[PDB]
Amino acid sequence: HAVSAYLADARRALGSAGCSQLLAALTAYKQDDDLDKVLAVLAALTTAKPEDFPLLHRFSMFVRPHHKQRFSQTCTDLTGRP
């Protein structure tokens, strides 16, 4: 139940509107395969406080195999290694 644990943590840290924006961006990503767009929503929401940085890295669970390397590189440039 990694997904429900992520959604519980994200709704707690980001609030309902922020969690809803993250899930809408995930929906859009599954439709359009645009990694940069989903990453930009996620980074706006999860890098405002250092304590939310793990929610940036943990989003990798939803990132498609062909984008996981680039996603991990960008998250490390934003926040360091997890």
Author numbering: 14 to 95
Q: What does the publication say?
A:
To understand the structural basis of RPA 32C and RTEL1 HHD2 interaction, we determined the structure of HHD2 at a resolution of 1.6 Å using X-ray crystallography (details in the Materials and Methods section). The structure revealed that HHD2 consists of five helices, from H1 to H5, connected by a short loop. A sequence alignment of HHD2 corresponding sequences of RTEL1 across the vertebrates, showed that the evolutionarily conserved residues are mainly present in the core region stabilizing the tertiary structure. The electrostatic surface potential of HHD2 revealed a distinct pattern of positively and negatively charged opposite surfaces. The electrostatic surface potential analysis, in combination with NMR CSPs, revealed that the positively charged surface of HHD2 could interacts with the negatively charged surface of 32C. Using NMR spectroscopy and isothermal titration calorimetry (ITC), we showed that HHD2 also interacts with DNA using the RPA 32C binding surface. The X-ray crystal structure of the HHD2 domain of RTEL1 reported here is the first structure of any domains of RTEL1.
The regulator of telomere elongation helicase 1 (RTEL1) is an Fe-S cluster and DEAH motif-containing DNA helicase with ATP-dependent 5′ to 3′ helicase activity. RTEL1 plays essential roles in telomere maintenance, DNA repair, meiotic recombination, and genome-wide replication. It is a modular protein consisting of an N-terminal helicase domain followed by two tandem harmonin homology domains 1&2 (HHD1 and HHD2), a PCNA-interacting protein-box (PIP-box) motif, and a C-terminal C4C4 type RING domain. RTEL1 is an anti-recombinase and executes non-crossovers by promoting the synthesis-dependent strand annealing (SDSA) pathway of homologous recombination through disassembling displacement-loop (D-loop) intermediates during the DNA repair and meiotic recombination processes.
